[PDB]
A paper describes a structure:
We expressed full-length [name] fused with a green fluorescent protein (GFP) in HEK293T cells and characterized its electrophysiological properties and show that it is a voltage-activated delayed rectifier potassium channel with a half-activation membrane potential of −10.0 ± 3.5 mV. The channel has a three-layer architecture: the upper extracellular turret, transmembrane domains, and intracellular domains occupying 3D space with a size of 130 Å × 130 Å × 130 Å. The tetrameric [name] apparatus adopts noncanonical non-domain-swapped VSDs, with distinct pore domain configurations.
Below the hydrophobic constriction sites are hydrophilic constriction sites through intrachain and interchain electrostatic interaction of Q472s and T468s. In the closed states and pre-open state 1, a strong and unambiguous density peak is located between the hydrophobic and hydrophilic constriction sites. The density is more likely to be a dehydrated potassium ion, and we name it site 6 or S6 as the seventh potassium ion selectivity site.
Residue numbers in the entry:
A (entry chain B), B (entry chain A): 11 to 301, 320 to 403, 408 to 692
The structure:
């Protein structure tokens, strides 16, 4: 979903000098300048920007005031016209210009920009200049000013009294561009020329699936008709072939309207190139396949379409397995057809008029019960029995089972079965390799988890870590792999450079920004920085976050669970569900000693930010630092001690005081 | 094993304002405050904490002194009562409050906290105020003070003379909460509602195994009865089916009392949701299976339970192999049943009254010796021979052996055996893939070791490292892989963020803390820092730790073996089993030159700490730095030289002195 607007303007331009300027802002500042206006006026594309689009920076002394009034009025209310003005270049050279103001609409019909096309008509008019010494100086400059608009555009009548003709041509140009000057500045979808269908359309995929099914049907049925002679010839079967043939012809015609995917880029929608691409790639095979025994067997070339279209599916693992099973079936069928052809050729020698005992057809006739008769020769098995027998034999010989009811006994059958085995071994090996790769795909991840589990267990066993601490480590490993399922956040967030990382981190830390009053006067950039700098931790019951002597260097926000801050074996604070603790880092500049132990009661969830990152962020943004200081109050400051004296000690010391 | 105490209090609360305060500490400081007390008094949950739970910070001028005496007495000795007091909000607004003090017991019946529930009865009493100008000001505030306790709690009789009714309701509320106010603050185990059994209980796993065995039995026996017609019908077999059916009905009833595991969380024990979950997931299959040929064959739907329950076992590698072997056996049995059904249907055409020679049953009858008789038709093989023959054939066709005694010869048998082969190829490929994955699991680790071994050997051979140094490198590689078995401590310790790392490191370095007088006045935090900062090394006989010019930058503790410090080819120190050497880093601030070579005599073990980490730790903790300086004496200081003059030189120079 691009926003191709400059590309359309320059494609339509044919070497123009458009001067896109903003509309909603006062004075209509210039936003963009083509590198054709840098030569028509001498102003580079670094000072023309942010200047008024009324060309107030090129208005001089003898400029027409009334044209200034007209252009001011045209800019005032949104309308398009055409004017001829007399401006000055960077060298204070008087030059006549043609201006073609036109507004450009937004997505929902709003004026956003004002496109100002400029043309040069210096040689086409009389630019009277005062600082001249000879008459010829009034002529040569005309050739100097106009070079790409005289010998290129209007050179058929470059002689006098043609100025009115030039004005008429300019008027015709400006009148017949009603919709060409408004390309609808908007983020639109890709567009295609008429009578062109997208290769990824909803209709095209269904057409491709239909073509695949029909190609499979042809591959199944053509060898059967070639080998078993069919010879039924109904009217309910000769029309299906014709329907399939006309469908394939329709597909050949329709493939000329397909958007070829570019070499690493995106779709290409130029009919002058798609035709040539198809002709050079795959117009010979398609024509040959869709054109006697040879004419009817050449139709197996339709598998080229299946080979071409199966590229995205071949990436997967199960799709290759299904494809291999299908080709296994088709190969078995084709070998069955060849085997029956051999068996039919071998029986009944024609030089003599006897029947061969060697052929598998005669042995099959003995084993079924229907023998041959007559001596022309008639009898034998039915037409279904022959095909079922052939398929059964070629399936015994491809799966490496080989029962032995139907087996080669003639010289030709043996040297054909040798090739059958040579092909079948490779096919079977391919299937086995695909299956084992498919299994390894998932057992790789499972073994990756179990290897870490076993390594941790063996490390704990080796260094004789006492029971009660090994159990906690094992439970933590199991629990974290159950919760996260092996998905590491850092590896995923390393990808997607820092435009989606900030948004993802803001979403992850939404519970400490939405439900906390401190992060309420923060700009988007500051929130992005804080979100990418927090990181979060998960606790377990009994785990300690800070001990009695650790250095507090992180502000911790509690979003789930409950914490217990205990000092001198006495509970002094209970936290949970929206409490912040730690130390006041931004105004102390000294790491302190955690005065109390912070234990976890239930399964907690903390969003802790390190000291250095927080200080860096608060130093970069000044106003937010003041807001953060004013609006944040820690519910448990782990720097100062709470002074108290226990009741049991009071009662114990009272007795001693009474004694003395 | 959570400590859900606040959750129980807030669940029982029904929008109360409990004010949990400590008990063992004098004045009973407030520990936790609900975010319902921040509006009943205006005190935020940042200044109410660490204040006396006697509400001394809200006691005003006209507060009842006698109620103060009662609450002081109630806090003095551990007892629970209820009082009505007249307190002040943050805006000095007189407000009547109901206080419901109650102690909370520890695990072993000890008073720990004092829960003080508060209620507002402002509109329910007459709060006389002095700073008033009109009578109506005495009424509107009543609507302002009470909003969530008048229109929500008591709105059925909001008229005069109902104050006594309100007092009676309050007394009834306080009297009938004897056990609800004491949730036994304690780290307890998960609890379940009555008549609910844990899904991981010791009984549930046995029940699941029994159900698995019975499902396997049904899958084995139902097709046999369907296909071979059985027709024995004893009284010792019709009751086993009934017993299994009632057992499965009992299981269907009992599965309504199972704790479903939450989506990523832990068990869910709400009967109103487990029932709906079971009904939506798996109540149709279970009902259909446990309900003619169809009614007796639908029982194979019981395999859904096996499919569901086998999720944790499917992770392993050998369990999948056992499952695949079992399904191989069951598939062979089912194909045997189908094969016998086909063979029985084919023999003896019923249109005529003859016997078919094609069927495998007739060929089997010929090969055994028992033929068919009569022409109704009687004879043939026994009932055991038919089943053994069918199983043998379908096992020859699944293992890709295919002897050929029993093989398809009829049209139906061939087109059934084709499907048999199509299934068997995939099954056999699956088994092979599983086996090779299982082998690769362990050969991956073995090859990982051998690849490093070969790389080291080839690197030593390539750069022609002289013999006597390559041998030492190879011996070190072999010895360290024998001792550690490929278990890297750093990779294991990277996991388990810094709460178990400190404990593990303290345990690993226990031999330098317990058996050394220097680490005897160290707090837990300092020991944790030192333990996580040491790292340890293993030596070999002949290896040198420090040379004659290296920079000493580590304090080394010897815990096993013996060291030899030699200077000028003379032994000047022997160390071992509790000796510390190195340099005095904390008061020199200059890296020195090791004055002597420290060789290893036996297989040593050192716990060496780098200079930077030790200095950082000793700079963070001040008192421990003084204790460490006072209590540590190095047995071999590798900064100062020992001045000595050898005896052999004395004797040699004596002769020269006598000569001159
Ligand atoms: K075989
Ligand atoms: K294999
Ligand atoms: K094989
Ligand atoms: K065989
Ligand atoms: K045989």
């Amino acid at each position: 979903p691009q926003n191709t607007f400059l590309e359309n303007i320059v494609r339509r331009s044919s070497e123009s000098s458009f001067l896109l300027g903003n509309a909603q802002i006062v004075d209509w500042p210039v936003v963009y300048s083509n590198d054709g206006f840098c030569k028509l006026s001498g102003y580079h594309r670094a000072d023309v920007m942010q200047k008024s689009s009324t060309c107030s920076f090129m208005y001089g002394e003898l400029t027409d005031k009334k044209t200034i009034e007209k252009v001011r009025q045209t800019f005032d209310n949104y309308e398009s016209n055409c004017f001829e003005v007399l401006l000055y270049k960077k060298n204070r050279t008087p030059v006549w210009f043609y201006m073609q103001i036109a507004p450009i609409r937004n997505e929902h019909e709003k004026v956003v920009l004002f496109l100002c096309t400029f043309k040069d008509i210096t040689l086409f008019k009389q630019p009277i200049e005062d600082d001249s010494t000879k008459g010829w100086t009034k002529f040569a400059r005309l050739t100097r000013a106009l070079t790409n608009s005289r010998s290129v555009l209007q050179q058929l009548t470059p002689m006098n009294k043609t100025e009115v003709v030039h004005k008429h041509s300019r008027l015709a140009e400006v009148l017949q561009l009603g919709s060409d000057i408004l390309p609808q500045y908007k983020q639109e979808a890709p567009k295609t020329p008429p009578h062109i269908i997208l290769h990824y359309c909803a209709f095209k995929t269904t057409w491709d699936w239909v073509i695949l099914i029909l190609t499979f049907y042809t591959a199944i049925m053509v060898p059967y008709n070639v080998s078993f002679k069919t010879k039924q010839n109904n009217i309910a079967w000769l029309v299906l072939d014709s329907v399939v043939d006309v469908i394939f012809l329709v597909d050949i015609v329709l493939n000329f309207h397909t958007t070829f995917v570019g070499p690493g880029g995106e779709v290409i929608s130029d009919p002058k190139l798609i035709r040539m691409n198809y002709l050079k790639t795959w117009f010979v095979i398609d024509l040959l396949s869709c054109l006697f025994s040879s004419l009817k067997v050449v139709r197996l070339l339709r598998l080229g379409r299946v080979a071409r279209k199966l590229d995205h599916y071949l990436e997967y693992g199960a799709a290759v397995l299904v494809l291999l099973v299908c080709v296994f079936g088709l190969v078995a069928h084709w070998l069955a057809c060849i085997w029956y052809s051999i068996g039919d050729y071998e029986v009944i020698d024609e030089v003599t008029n006897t029947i061969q005992i060697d052929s598998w057809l005669y042995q099959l006739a003995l084993s079924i019960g229907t023998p041959y008769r007559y001596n022309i020769w008639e009898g034998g098995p039915s037409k279904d029995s022959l095909y079922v027998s052939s398929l059964y034999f070629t399936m015994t010989s491809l799966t490496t089972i080989g029962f032995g009811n139907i087996a080669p006994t003639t010289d030709v059958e043996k040297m054909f079965s040798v090739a059958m085995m040579m092909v079948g071994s490779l096919l079977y090996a391919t299937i086995f390799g695909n299956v084992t790769t498919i299994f390894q795909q998932m057992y790789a991840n499972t073994n990756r988890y179990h290897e870490m589990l076993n390594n941790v267990r063996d490390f704990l066993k080796l260094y004789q870590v006492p029971k009660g601490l090994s159990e906690r480590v094992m439970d933590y490993i199991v629990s974290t792999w159950s919760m996260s399922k092996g998905i590491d956040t850092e590896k995923v967030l390393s990808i997607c450079p820092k435009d989606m990382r900030a948004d993802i981190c803001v979403h992850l830390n939404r519970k400490v920004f939405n439900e906390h009053p401190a992060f309420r006067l923060a700009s988007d950039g500051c929130l992005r920085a804080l979100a990418v700098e927090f990181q979060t931790i998960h606790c377990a019951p009994g785990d300690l976050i800070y001990h009695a002597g650790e250095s507090v260097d992180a502000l911790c926000f509690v979003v789930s669970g409950s914490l217990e801050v205990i000092q001198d074996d006495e509970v002094v604070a209970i936290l949970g569900k929206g409490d912040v603790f730690g130390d006041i880092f931004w105004k102390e500049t000294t790491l302190a000693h955690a005065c109390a132990n912070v234990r976890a009661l239930t399964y907690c969830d903390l969003h802790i930010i390190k000291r250095e990152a927080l200080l860096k962020v608060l130093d970069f943004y000044t106003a937010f630092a003041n807001s953060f200081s004013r609006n944040l109050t820690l519910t448990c400051n782990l720097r100062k001690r709470i002074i108290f004296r226990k009741i049991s000690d009071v009662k114990k010391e009272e007795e001693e005081r009474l004694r003395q």
